[PDB]
Each structure stands twice: as structure tokens, then as C-alpha cells.
């Protein structure tokens, strides 16, 4: 039995549609903000102003997810050993809730940070090899919904540029709100890197399952 390309959580037609439009609102609200705007210059090398939208041009189709374990039909290092797990496997099918406690962009990427909970955790790989940007942080902390890439950008891009703006987050909590979004304060941690911290976590369901391409 050859595995999934990859494991994760699915989101319902609903939770994905609702967080895809937060999504969309998100990067026109940013792109037409005055913080943004001035900022340009560290986020594109390219010279008027800038629909993220149109930016953040390869979007996943259908229905949004948060990756667990990329197995690559067991071709990734570690897979067999992550499907194998009895969490795995008793957790697939099943459905849970994911927090999404944040929306963030990079010149790279666009996305949604979620914060597992300790049940979901456990459906967290832990590889031999890390990225070193999740150093210092709690396991977990690379958990996303991707919700756009820049044309060149390559896939898992959005989870190192989640780290690597907690880690900036952990050292300096940094910023004051530049700007009041209307469902939180919004972060400019420099470099093009943005951050929507929201006032209020949304709850997204999604189902634990295998994807085989
Ligand atoms: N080396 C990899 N490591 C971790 N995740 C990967 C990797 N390659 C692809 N993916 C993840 O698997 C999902 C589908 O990838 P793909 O479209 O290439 O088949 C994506 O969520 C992607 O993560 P991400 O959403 O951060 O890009």
C-alpha cells in the first residue's frame, strides 16, 4: 500500500470558502493600506500600487487545507513511519476544529497561521531533519492554510515563511499596530512581511485525511 501524496486537514465547503474570502478581503484591505503602500519597495523590485490579489496569483482550487505530514506516496523521508502511527490512523476521517489565530504575506506567500490544539498535535509530525527557522519554537508553530504564492514560488514555501515570521514574533513582539483592520491589528515586521493578527480566532472545520493527487 503506497501512501497519500500528503496527510492533513480538509476544510468543509463552508469553512473554506469562509476563510478563502477572509483571504481575499485581507490582501485587498493591506494593499490599499497607506503602511503598505510606503513599504513597496521592500516587497517587489518592480516600478502606482500593487493588487496583492492578482500578486498572490496561484491560489490552491477547491478546498483549503492544513498540511500535516508531505509523504509523497512514501517517498519522503519519515512517511511511512508518520502513517503508520496509531493517531494517524484512528484519527483518519475524523473531524476537527482548526484555529486560525492569524493572516499573514510575504513577498513569497500568503496565508493563514493555525494553532493546533494538544489532541491535534499529535498529528504533528516529529522528523529527523527540521527546517533550523522553527528553532526555539513550540512544535507545531508551522502549522498553515495556504491561500497564495507568488508565480515563482515554490510549495512548503509558506510554512518556512510562517516560522520565520514567529520568529521574529517571539524576539521583540514586533510591532505596534501600524494600522486597525477590522478584525485586528495589523503588524509590519519589515521585508515585505505583513501581518493581520486577528482580535477574534476563527474557527474553521476540516476533516483528517489522506490526499493522492
Ligand atoms: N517538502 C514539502 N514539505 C512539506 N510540505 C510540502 C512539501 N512539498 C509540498 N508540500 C505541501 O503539500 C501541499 C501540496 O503541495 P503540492 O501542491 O506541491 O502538491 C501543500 O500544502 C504543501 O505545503 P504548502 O501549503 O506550504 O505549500
Not at 482550487?61 to 519519515?78: E, Q, R, S
Not at 476544529?97 to 504533528?124: C, H, N, R
Not at 509530525?125 to 519554537?137: F, T
Request: hydrophobic content about 35%; charged content about 25%; aromatic content about 10%.
Amino acid at each position: 500500500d503506497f501512501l497519500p501524496l500528503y496527510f492533513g486537514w480538509f476544510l468543509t465547503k463552508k469553512s473554506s470558502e469562509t476563510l478563502r474570502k477572509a483571504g481575499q478581503v485581507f490582501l485587498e484591505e493591506l494593499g490599499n493600506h497607506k503602511a503598505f503602500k510606503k513599504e513597496l519597495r521592500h516587497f517587489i523590485s518592480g516600478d502606482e500600487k500593487l493588487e496583492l490579489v492578482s500578486y498572490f496569483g496561484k491560489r490552491p482550487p477547491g478546498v483549503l487545507h492544513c498540511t500535516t505530514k508531505f509523504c509523497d506516496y512514501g517517498k519522503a523521508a519519515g512517511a511511512e513511519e508518520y502513517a503508520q502511527q496509531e493517531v494517524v490512523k484512528r484519527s483518519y476521517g475524523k473531524a476537527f476544529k482548526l484555529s486560525i489565530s492569524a493572516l499573514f504575506v510575504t513577498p513569497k506567500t500568503a496565508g493563514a497561521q493555525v494553532v493546533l490544539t494538544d489532541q491535534e498535535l499529535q498529528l504533528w509530525p516529529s522528523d529527523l531533519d527540521k527546517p533550523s527557522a522553527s528553532e526555539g519554537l513550540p512544535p507545531g508553530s508551522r502549522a498553515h492554510v495556504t491561500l497564495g504564492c507568488a508565480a515563482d514560488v515554490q510549495p512548503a514555501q509558506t510554512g518556512l515563511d510562517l516560522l520565520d515570521i514567529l520568529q521574529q514574533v517571539k524576539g521583540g513582539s514586533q510591532g505596534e499596530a501600524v494600522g486597525e483592520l477590522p478584525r485586528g491589528k495589523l503588524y509590519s515586521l519589515g521585508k515585505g512581511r505583513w501581518m493581520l493578527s486577528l482580535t477574534k480566532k476563527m474557527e474553521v472545520k476540516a476533516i483528517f485525511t489522506g490526499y493522492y493527487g
